[PDB]
Amino acid sequence: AKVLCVLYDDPVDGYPKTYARDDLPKIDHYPGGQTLPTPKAIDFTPGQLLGSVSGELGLRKYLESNGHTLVVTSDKDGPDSVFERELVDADVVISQPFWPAYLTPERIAKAKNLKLALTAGIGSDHVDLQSAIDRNVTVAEVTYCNSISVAEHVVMMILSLVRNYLPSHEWARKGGWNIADCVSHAYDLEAMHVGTVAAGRIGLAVLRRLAPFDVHLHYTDRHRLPESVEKELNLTWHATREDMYPVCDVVTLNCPLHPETEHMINDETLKLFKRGAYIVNTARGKLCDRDAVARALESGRLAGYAGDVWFPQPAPKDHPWRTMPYNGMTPHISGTTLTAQARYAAGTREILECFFEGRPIRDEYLIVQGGALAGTGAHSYSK
Amino acid sequence: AKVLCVLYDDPVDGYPKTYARDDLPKIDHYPGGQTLPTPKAIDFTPGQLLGSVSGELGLRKYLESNGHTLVVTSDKDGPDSVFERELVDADVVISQPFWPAYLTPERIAKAKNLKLALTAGIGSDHVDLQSAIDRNVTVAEVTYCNSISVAEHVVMMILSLVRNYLPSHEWARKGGWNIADCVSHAYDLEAMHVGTVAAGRIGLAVLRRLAPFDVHLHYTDRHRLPESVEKELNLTWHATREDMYPVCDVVTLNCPLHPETEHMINDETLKLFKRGAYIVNTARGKLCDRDAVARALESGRLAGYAGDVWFPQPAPKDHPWRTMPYNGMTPHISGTTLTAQARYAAGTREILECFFEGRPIRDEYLIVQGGALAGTGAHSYSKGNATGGSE
Ligand SMILES: NC(=O)c1ccc[n+]([C@@H]2O[C@H](COP(=O)([O-])OP(=O)(O)OC[C@H]3O[C@@H](n4cnc5c(N)ncnc54)[C@H](O)[C@@H]3O)[C@@H](O)[C@H]2O)c1
Numbered sequence: 001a002k003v004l005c006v007l008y009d010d011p012v013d014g015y016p017k018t019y020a021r022d023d024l025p026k027i028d029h030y031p032g033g034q035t036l037p038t039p040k041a042i043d044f045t046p047g048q049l050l051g052s053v054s055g056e057l058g059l060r061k062y063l064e065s066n067g068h069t070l071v072v073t074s075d076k077d078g079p080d081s082v083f084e085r086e087l088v089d090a091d092v093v094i095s096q097p098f099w100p101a102y103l104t105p106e107r108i109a110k111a112k113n114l115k116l117a118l119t120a121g122i123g124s125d126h127v128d129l130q131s132a133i134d135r136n137v138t139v140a141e142v143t144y145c146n147s148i149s150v151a152e153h154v155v156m157m158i159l160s161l162v163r164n165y166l167p168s169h170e171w172a173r174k175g176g177w178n179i180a181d182c183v184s185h186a187y188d189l190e191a192m193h194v195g196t197v198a199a200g201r202i203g204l205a206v207l208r209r210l211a212p213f214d215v216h217l218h219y220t221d222r223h224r225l226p227e228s229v230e231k232e233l234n235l236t237w238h239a240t241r242e243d244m245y246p247v248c249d250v251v252t253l254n255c256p257l258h259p260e261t262e263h264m265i266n267d268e269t270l271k272l273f274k275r276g277a278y279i280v281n282t283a284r285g286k287l288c289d290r291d292a293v294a295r296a297l298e299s300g301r302l303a304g305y306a307g308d309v310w311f312p313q314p315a316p317k318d319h320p321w322r323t324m325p326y327n328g329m330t331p332h333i334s335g336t337t338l339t340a341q342a343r344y345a346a347g348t349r350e351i352l353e354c355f356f357e358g359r360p361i362r363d364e365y366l367i368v369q370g371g372a373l374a375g376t377g378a379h380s381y382s383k
Numbered sequence: 384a385k386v387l388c389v390l391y392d393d394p395v396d397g398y399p400k401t402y403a404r405d406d407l408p409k410i411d412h413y414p415g416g417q418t419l420p421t422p423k424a425i426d427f428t429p430g431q432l433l434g435s436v437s438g439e440l441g442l443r444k445y446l447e448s449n450g451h452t453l454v455v456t457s458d459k460d461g462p463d464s465v466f467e468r469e470l471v472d473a474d475v476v477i478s479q480p481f482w483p484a485y486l487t488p489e490r491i492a493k494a495k496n497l498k499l500a501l502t503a504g505i506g507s508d509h510v511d512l513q514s515a516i517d518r519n520v521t522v523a524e525v526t527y528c529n530s531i532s533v534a535e536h537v538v539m540m541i542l543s544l545v546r547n548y549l550p551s552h553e554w555a556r557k558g559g560w561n562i563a564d565c566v567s568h569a570y571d572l573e574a575m576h577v578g579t580v581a582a583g584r585i586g587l588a589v590l591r592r593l594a595p596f597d598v599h600l601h602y603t604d605r606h607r608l609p610e611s612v613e614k615e616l617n618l619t620w621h622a623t624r625e626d627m628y629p630v631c632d633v634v635t636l637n638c639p640l641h642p643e644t645e646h647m648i649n650d651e652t653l654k655l656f657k658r659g660a661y662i663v664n665t666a667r668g669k670l671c672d673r674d675a676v677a678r679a680l681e682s683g684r685l686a687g688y689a690g691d692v693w694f695p696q697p698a699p700k701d702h703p704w705r706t707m708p709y710n711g712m713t714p715h716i717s718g719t720t721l722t723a724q725a726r727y728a729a730g731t732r733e734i735l736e737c738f739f740e741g742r743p744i745r746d747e748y749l750i751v752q753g754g755a756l757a758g759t760g761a762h763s764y765s766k767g768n769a770t771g772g773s774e
């Protein structure tokens with residue numbers, strides 16, 4: 001089979017020779033009991049840079065040893081990219097959400113041998129699910145691999161916005177002190193109302209981490225949590241996302257991108273937010289109407305916006321989120337820390353082994369299979 | 384009496400006429416039961432900028448109406464400063480740790496009328512306590528006013544350093560993407576070992592906040608926590624700070640600055656740290672040898688250093704921590720968010736009313752009283768002078 005794997009470039013100064021530390025912390029399983037990936041073997045050492053072109057997700061030996069072809073490229077956008085040229089006869093397409101090879105309807109029609117589109121991370125919205133269902137393409141992703149890594153990134157961003165960290169670091173770096181200039185836009189998080197749109201793997205990890213900060217917790221989801229869990233975390237349930245907005249100081253988005261959530265944050269829904277509210281979005285860029293968010297920071301409606309996800313990716317040089325007022329943006333990296341890479345590289349291999357060996361792909365990993373949504377796809381998406 | 388109050392300058396664009404939000408969250412007391420400040424009244428609206436020269440900690444009406452002269456200035460350094468000139472006959476000196484009026488042995492000796500040195504914030508190390516003790520000056524601070532504010536800043540800073548937030552933000556703002564450049568130095572915090580030097584009000588607030596991150600928690604302190612707390616947070620106790628360093632991925636310093644802690648992080652103790660360790664210091668700058676920390680980052684012994692505290696304050700323009708590799712520094716702001724200012728501005732007024740009315744100053748606020756360390760000062764400090772090099 002031909003495996004076409006789209007990865008990001010290596011660091012500008014080359015593939016790293018050394019790393020900052022010698023080992024990675026050890027984790028046994030994910031919260032709730034799902035086990036870490038179970039490939040028969042791995043050809044890398046956890047901690048190495050695996051999502052860049054030279055890392056190849058540690059898959060070359062395994063594939064070539066089994067008679068497959070592995071094509072690795074970072075050139076993915078447009079009609080003349082290596083990705084589009086190589087796609088026509090690829091049997092398996094792999095890309096990461098951080099540097100995604102978008103599988104539009106037009107690209108899936110041209111990919112005449114396509115049988116599996118694998119996401120090396122979580123979030124398969126860069127793949128047209130309906131064309132995959134119509135073409136019988138299996139769509140799978142590495143469920144839970146970086147859900148905790150993103151939760152950490154959310155808490156970090158929330159505190160950063162509220163405490164005015166970014167601008168204050170600039171003053172230090174530039175030779176100032178200027179305490180008043182740093183703190184006239186700075187508050188403590190303590191006792192603020194924080195709401196999450198979805199309480200899935202990421203959303204629930206965020207809520208647990210925020211609990212000791214003594215904030216008031218709110219949530220909404222397609223799937224309401226058991227009352228006993230709501231009681232344990234002191235959560236207030238909201239049946240709709242619009243009912244939640246008005247009472248929150250901070251809103252964090254942790255739902256997938258699908259037809260029901262696309263453009264949920266827009267000029268109309270932004271009017272439901274209190275003046276000086278904060279939005280953190282590490283889920284997907286398209287959950288927000290781009291210009292409406294910028295207009296809300298320019299007008300003082302929002303006191304801050306931070307996230308690591310944008311639309312499209314890579315974001316254009318001039319994307320307005322890069323420079324709008326009080327932004328705490330990063331390029332898409334929360335789910336691609338070196339720790340996380342080791343887990344999804346291992347799960348990408350487990351899924352390929354199953355797939356080539358004719359064994360079932362875990363259900364938790366499936367998004368689309370055999371002409372319909374399946375497993376996590378049925379739980380969390382909509383076509 | 385004459386009250387000499389040193390505050391930081393107003394914003395470069397003027398004293399704000401508007402704020403980002405309409406209210407502040409309401410809190411009832413501090414963790415463990417301590418009540419918030421109880422001045423008889425407050426002449427400000429919580430949420431306003433109070434620690435700057437035009438904010439005056441909301442004290443002018445109260446003081447002038449009671450017969451006291453309030454001299455407010457940001458000019459605090461050197462012998463030709465307004466502060467130095469006015470100090471000779473001030474009865475009461477007020478300063479905040481973020482823009483500290485150093486009361487060195489020399490200044491205390493010239494301050495013929497000084498009776499009370501009040502810290503509008505927490506941390507009185509900018510005052511020579513031995514000289515205060517010698518001269519019978521009362522030293523008081525607004526205990527607990529920003530311990531939670533600071534514990535939030537520590538968690539923020541631990542995450543930023545580990546996840547390599549700052550350099551990543553620079554890439555986004557400059558027009559880049561460069562995923563590999565951002566994550567070649569980024570890890571998840573989950574399951575790392577995190578240790579705190581001291582488990583007081585900030586330290587313990589820090590430990591409670593890190594627990595759900597699933598990290599292994601370690602600590603050391605002059606005063607051991609109760610077994611149920613240790614049990615509840617699954618803490619590992621270390622008799623010495625030198626026993627704890629070696630097993631930690633991240634070390635956060637949360638003790639006061641005094642002779643026993645001054646320069647605890649230096650070229651020799653840095654050698655006990657694992658390679659790629661992180662240090663967060665929002666306590667005091669002088670707990671660390673300045674150049675030793677910069678060398679450790681340059682050499683790779685340390686994978687990050689972040690804090691908001693420096694020595695002296697303000698830090699010189701060329702202070703090395705401003706530009707060393709992998710730093711997550713800010714000027715001294717954690718304890719002076721708009722939220723914390725309302726609490727210490729209220730607490731400063733409560734101590735003054737007590738002082739002037741001949742009512743007892745809360746024991747929890749006392750550092751030095753009647754010729755000796757007293758209240759919180761006997762609990763958390765050791766006597767000496769930490770103001771050397773303040774100039
Ligand atoms: N920034 C990053 O690196 C990164 C990394 C991982 C995931 N993510 C994003 O976060 C999403 C969530 O990840 P996860 O691991 O928590 O997944 P998950 O499937 O466990 O959780 C998603 C939750 O969203 C809820 N949901 C679905 N539709 C909804 C709707 N219309 N309204 C409200 N809630 C709805 C589901 O019921 C579920 O509880 C991913 O799909 C991806 O888009 C981003």
Ligand SMILES: NC(=O)c1ccc[n+]([C@@H]2O[C@H](COP(=O)([O-])OP(=O)(O)OC[C@H]3O[C@@H](n4cnc5c(N)ncnc54)[C@H](O)[C@@H]3O)[C@@H](O)[C@H]2O)c1
Nearest residue numbers: 505506530581583584585604605638639643665666718763
């Ligand atoms: N960045 C800022 O805004 C800011 C704000 C407030 C306080 N601080 C600093 O943090 C310090 C701690 O504040 P807090 O509210 O926790 O005070 P606290 O008195 O409640 O905590 C101090 C803890 O340090 C412990 N300790 C004392 N000497 C020690 C030693 N030699 N070794 C190890 N532990 C020792 C004490 O036993 C006590 O548990 C303040 O003194 C100040 O220096 C910084």
